Amino acid sequence: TYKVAVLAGDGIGPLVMKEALKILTFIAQKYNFSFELNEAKIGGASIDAYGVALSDETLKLCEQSDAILFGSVGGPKWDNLPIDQRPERASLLPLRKHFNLFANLRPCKIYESLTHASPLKNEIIQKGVDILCVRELTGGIYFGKQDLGKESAYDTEIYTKKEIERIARIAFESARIRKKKVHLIDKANVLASSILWREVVANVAKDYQDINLEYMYVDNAAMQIVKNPSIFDVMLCSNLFGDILSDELAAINGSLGLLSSASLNDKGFGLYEPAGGSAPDIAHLNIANPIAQILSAALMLKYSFKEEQAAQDIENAISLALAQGKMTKDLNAKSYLNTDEMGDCILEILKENDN
Amino acid sequence: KTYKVAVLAGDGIGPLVMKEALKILTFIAQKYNFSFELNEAKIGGASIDAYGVALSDETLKLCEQSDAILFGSVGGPKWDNLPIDQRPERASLLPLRKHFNLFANLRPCKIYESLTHASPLKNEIIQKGVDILCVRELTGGIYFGKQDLGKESAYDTEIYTKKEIERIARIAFESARIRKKKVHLIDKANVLASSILWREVVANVAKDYQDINLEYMYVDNAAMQIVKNPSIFDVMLCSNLFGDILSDELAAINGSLGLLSSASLNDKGFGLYEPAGGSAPDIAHLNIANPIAQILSAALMLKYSFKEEQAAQDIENAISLALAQGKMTKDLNAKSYLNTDEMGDCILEILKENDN
């Protein structure tokens, strides 16, 4: 059994989660493995029931699971609580800390059928953009010693070998099952901490002689994402640099509703969620794009459960659905499918290819 | 009125494109009834060959004795093998920037309507018109703070003073005043203490510039907006690190490297003005290099060191018009192009045609 804590949350979360569960249920059937999918409240849902955004019983469920499939949290009903009790701050941050989720993986794949929605000219991306941004979450400038004075202020970009090594291993493991290339993004021509990155990564790379390792400065990487992004496979970044480039990658993608995120530790545990936010203003309708949630469930199969073919099947189903013109309102305003119709479309493609 | 300019044309294409910038400036001086004293000196590889060093004491003294430096390009294969600190670029620009306290780098990103095809952004993204000025602080922050490389740990320090922030902010607002009256301060104030200080100091500088719209934007959002919606920007005021990243992103969206210029300024009107691109050694013997970046550096020098705003504008409009007429060098149109001297002459002829 693969034990999944399903925390769908608020607003569109339960509605899009229903579609991901539909797809995973089929996948477990096809591959003859079992899911235990324990749904539990998180966020606003949990504040209503239990008075807090993350209950002890829900935390313990997560500890007993192999991964967390997370929806979205937050909405107007709870916007008036004390800041520290509000759904998002009180759910995701403590989970990341509890489970030492030090690595964020955000794919940037541009689907041939949605090339028009990228802000980049079609000729720039025509070879195919398929990138994975791997960002360290625990180290560097966001956590180093800092001081605000009246006349002077500083912050400290500090990293350890332990921090670099564990994120580097995540990146190479990804590259192994993608296109076998890692670009280490740094500023080694001036930063001592970037020099340490290169030393540690080059040493980790000895275990991964099948992977092509390249180094690129963060300023050149900001250029290349605009000028020639098809070269990238895995992009390994520090916390600060990843925070910047992951947004740039989102921007070149063009289809925000398809973007997913995995926050992983070093033991195969992850929290998998759509990149986008709540969408309270469409929560009562049946139009939200479920593809990001479904793609989060694929990432969970690939990275927490090592069910690579199952993941691939889901991804190929989405590619084919989009290639057939089957899309939600955010992707095609003139001709679209409702959330449940989109889920069913994907399911049917999975069944059509199950021979 | 005599404006004294140290002309340091350098290596490769530098001397060839400089000729065209001097041609345009000579006409501008005639039209506006002022004079230039142009003193040419060696820099970079040329200077290493003649004097053993990339910047000679007499060339340094000449600069001190001038009102601005109009710089070409330095570097080439011949000197690529020297120690890193002695190579033409490092050994010319860095000492000059230090000597003259050139703490502000100004890089315009203007996409010409006739060259929209050359931007990697879809035409629809940029169609409203992209005209941005990146203002990057050069003396502070993480590149100069305390750092240490250990075996198990390493750090660098993003440190800024109020003095550093105030001087670059003033430069940005003064630019915004004569552009579109908008500054975006690019920071990470939700997490960096140094960014909080930026916002404090900049908001205080802003009191003197009540005609300018000041907005704040996080660096990560700025990296997105340059791709998704760049026409919103006028002046983009950045720290050293953030400017280093976003200036390159802006170059990327621009698409026409041969048109890009740079000014490095202090607080007293002195500046070093150069093309953003390199010395293009492999085409140096030919007559095809794009002189427009060099000419645009000359215009920036007029605008910012000599306060000859209209003369600068006249050069910029002459370029716009030449491009709009399809008159371009090989790098911009491979099928039908003008040689370097023809391009210069074309711009000159447009300047004369509009001199009524």
Here the tokens at position A252 are 């070149």
- What was the resolution (in A) of this experimentally determined structure? 1.9
- Rounded to the nearest angstrom, the minimum Cα separation between A150 and chain B is 8
For residue A55, which phi and psi values (nearest 5 degrees)?
A: -80, 160
Question: Residues near A85 by Cβ (< 8 Å), separated by ≥ 6?
Answer: A47, A52, A53
Residue B109: how many other CB atoms lie within 10 Å: 25
Phi-psi region of B34 (alpha: psi -120 to 50; beta: other; left: phi over 0): beta
Residue A256: how many other CB atoms lie within 10 Å: 16
CA dist., res. B299 & res. B99, Å (int): 23
Report CA-CA distances (Å) from B128 to B3, B111, B228, B259: 37, 10, 12, 20
DSSP codes of every residue in A332-348: -SSS---HHHHHHHHHH
Assigned fold of B1-356: Isopropylmalate Dehydrogenase (3.40.718)
For residue A106, which phi and psi values (nearest 5 degrees)?
A: -130, 110
What angle in degrees, to the nearest 10, is found between the helix axes of A291-303 and A13-31? Answer: 40
Question: Cα-atom radius of gyration of chain B, to the nearest Å?
Answer: 20
CA B268 to chain centre: 17
CA dist., res. B191 & res. B279, Å (int): 40
Strands laid side by side in the B147-149 sheet: A147-148, A152-160, B153-161, B147-149
What type of residue sits at position A18? K
Task: Yes or no: say if A200 and A164 are a contact pair by the CB < 8 Å rule.
Answer: yes
DSSP codes of every residue in A261-295: EEEE-TTS-EEEEESS---GGGTTSS----HHHHH
Catalytic center residues of B: 143, 188, 220, 244, 248
The per-residue b/e assignment along A264-301, b for 16 or more CB within 10 angstroms, e otherwise, is bbeeebbbbbbbbebbbebbeeebbbbbbbbbbbbbbb
Residue whose C-alpha is closest to residue A103's, from A217, A214, A239: A239
- Rounded to the nearest angstrom, the minimum Cα separation between B241 and chain A is 9
Task: Yes or no: say if B18 and B7 are a contact pair by the CB < 8 Å rule.
Answer: yes
Question: Cα-atom radius of gyration of chain A, to the nearest Å?
Answer: 20
Chain B neighbours among A 211-250 (CB < 8 Å)? Answer: 218-220, 222-224, 226-227, 240, 243-248, 250
For residue A167, which phi and psi values (nearest 5 degrees)?
A: -75, -40
CA dist., res. B347 & res. B333, Å (int): 17
Q: Does A147 touch chain B (CB under 8 A)?
A: yes
Task: Yes or no: say if A175 and A145 are a contact pair by the CB < 8 Å rule.
Answer: no
Q: Does A144 touch chain B (CB under 8 A)?
A: yes
CA A37 to chain centre: 20
Query: In chain B, which residues have their Cβ closer than 8 Å to the Cβ of A244?
Result: 219-220, 223, 245
CA B58 to chain centre: 25
Which residues have a C–N gap over 2.5 Å right after them in chain A?
none
Interface test with A, best of B151, B248, B254, B257 (most A CBs within 10 A): B248
CA angle B188, B175, B163 (to 5 degrees): 55
CA dist., res. B80 & res. B45, Å (int): 10
Question: Residues near B141 by Cβ (< 8 Å), separated by ≥ 6?
Answer: B158, B159, B160, B194, B239, B240, B241
Please indicate the experimental technique that yielded this structure: X-ray
Q: Does A189 touch chain B (CB under 8 A)?
A: no
Q: Does B334 touch chain A (CB under 8 A)?
A: no
Q: Do strands A270-274 and A260-264 pair parallel, antiparallel, or not at all (unpaired)?
A: antiparallel
Based on the residue annotation, tell me whether A142 is a catalytic residue of this protein: yes
* Chain A residue closest in CA terms to B149: A192
Q: Where are the beta strands (DSSP E) in B150-298?
A: 153-161, 182-187, 213-218, 235-238, 261-265, 271-275
CA dihedral B242, B243, B244, B245 (to 10 degrees): 60
Here the tokens at position B153 are 């740990």
Residue whose C-alpha is closest to residue A222's, from A187, A193, A192: A187
Query: In chain A, which residues have their Cβ closer than 8 Å to the Cβ of B155?
Result: 144, 156-159, 192-193
DSSP codes of every residue in A70-116: EEE---GGGTTS-GGGSHHHHHHHHHHHHTT--EEEEEEE--GGGGG
Which listed residue (A50, A181, A187, A217) is catalytic? A187
CA dist., res. B6 & res. B68, Å (int): 6
Q: Does A285 touch chain B (CB under 8 A)?
A: no
Q: Does A150 touch chain B (CB under 8 A)?
A: yes
Longest CA–CA separation in chain A, Å: 70
Task: Yes or no: say if A19 and A54 are a contact pair by the CB < 8 Å rule.
Answer: no
Task: Yes or no: say if A272 and A299 are a contact pair by the CB < 8 Å rule.
Answer: yes
Is A82 within any annotated ligand binding site?
yes
Helix (H, G, I), strand (E, B) or coil at A7: strand
CA A311 to chain centre: 14
Residue whose C-alpha is closest to residue B344's, from B281, B279, B274, B296: B296
Phi-psi region of B10 (alpha: psi -120 to 50; beta: other; left: phi over 0): left
CA dist., res. B57 & res. B43, Å (int): 11
> Between B122, B194, B220, which is nearest A119 by CB?
B122
Longest CA–CA separation in chain B, Å: 70
CA angle A211, A213, A219 (to 5 degrees): 145
Helix (H, G, I), strand (E, B) or coil at A11: coil
CA dist., res. A165 & res. A185, Å (int): 15
Q: Which letter does DSSP use for residue B128 in this model?
A: T
Q: Does A121 touch chain B (CB under 8 A)?
A: yes
By the 10 Å C-beta count (0-12 exposed, 13-18 middle, 19+ buried), B311 is classed as buried
CA B143 to chain centre: 20
Question: Which CATH number does the domain A1-355 belong to among 3.40.30.10, 3.40.190.10, 3.40.718.10, 3.40.50.2020?
Answer: 3.40.718.10
Q: Which residues pair with A38 in a beta bridge?
A: A5
> Between A149, A195, A222, which is nearest B154 by CB?
A195
For residue A88, which phi and psi values (nearest 5 degrees)?
A: -70, -55
Based on the residue annotation, tell me whether A313 is a catalytic residue of this protein: no
A251–B244 CB contact, under 8 Å: no
Q: Token match 């975006």: residue? A: B184
Here the tokens at position B341 are 């001297």
